[PDB]
Amino acid sequence: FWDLEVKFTGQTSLLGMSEARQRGYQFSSDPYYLTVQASYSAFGLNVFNLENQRLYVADLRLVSQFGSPRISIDTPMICARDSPSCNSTHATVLIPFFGGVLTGINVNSVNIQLSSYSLQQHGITLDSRNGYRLYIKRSTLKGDRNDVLVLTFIYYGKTVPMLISLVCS
Amino acid sequence: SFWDLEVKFTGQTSLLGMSEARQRGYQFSSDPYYLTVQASYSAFGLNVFNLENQRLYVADLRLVSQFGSPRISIDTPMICARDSPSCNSTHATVLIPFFGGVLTGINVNSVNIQLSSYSLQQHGITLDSRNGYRLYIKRSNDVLVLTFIYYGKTVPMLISLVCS
């Protein structure tokens, strides 16, 4: 099958399916996808923090137990669980500096050039002093439960798109 | 370039783009059911061993994707006794030098001998393993597969049993 190798606190550990399922991971097979899911209580998660918004990062890899075609699949997870925080006019997404370089922004299937003018036109302001601080104009949104943000990072050699709903909670 | 070819050579690793690898002697073909990686014997980063006029070519290859979230890495090592077998009379000989790989399985014509009710001797194969693997196959189409455990990878090496 596949085993889960977890990079945690600098060490590499291999986890069987049973251990991972007990410790907060789920593995499901689709006719089209292999699906890996992690609960925020799962083992080996690293929890960064920017203000009151939490970013959970898991550096995960799927390693085949069948060594003849030895296959290794990096499946890193980067999630700002508590994002966004909203106020009267702006929804704020706060990403701490965690090893990921913000390389792309997508709002409702629209990729936004990182030009300051393009971001401002799209109602987005980006602060880079202490982590990435996104303040997103609520007007440009398209209602509630209808808006998605994909922040793409380059995380330790892997391009990781993080999909979050921009709902105020 | 979907995939990059990682070659381990002289204790170092060189990552090669698809076009560079093709330049340096590799070929890549895609089927609906298989990915195909081919290496000519002149390809870059091949390790060549010699025992007795028979050469073992070892490539420590790994395809490494340039993709995004799924950075998949597949070890595709290749081991080939190019010159085997040497036939004189009543013996076809296959010679494998000690190269760090562990001989774990011998398969002659879709007959796995480790899982067979008959012995190697009953299959007509004589194995000498003091100074490399020497297989003595009585002469009196057919293919032989030698399976190796090499650095944690299982590498079946298929050769035809024709007389060179």
Binding site: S68, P69, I71 | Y33, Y34, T76, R82
Partner: peptide, 28 residues
């Protein structure tokens, strides 16, 4: 031609199956 190295007089060939396997929910 299934994760096996096919040795020829001029080239070495390996075929890597494209379809990935499952984990315990198809054939445990």
């Amino acid at each position: 031609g299934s994760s096996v190295v096919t040795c020829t007089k001029d080239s070495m060939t390996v075929r890597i199956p494209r379809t990935l396997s499952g984990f315990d929910d198809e054939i445990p």
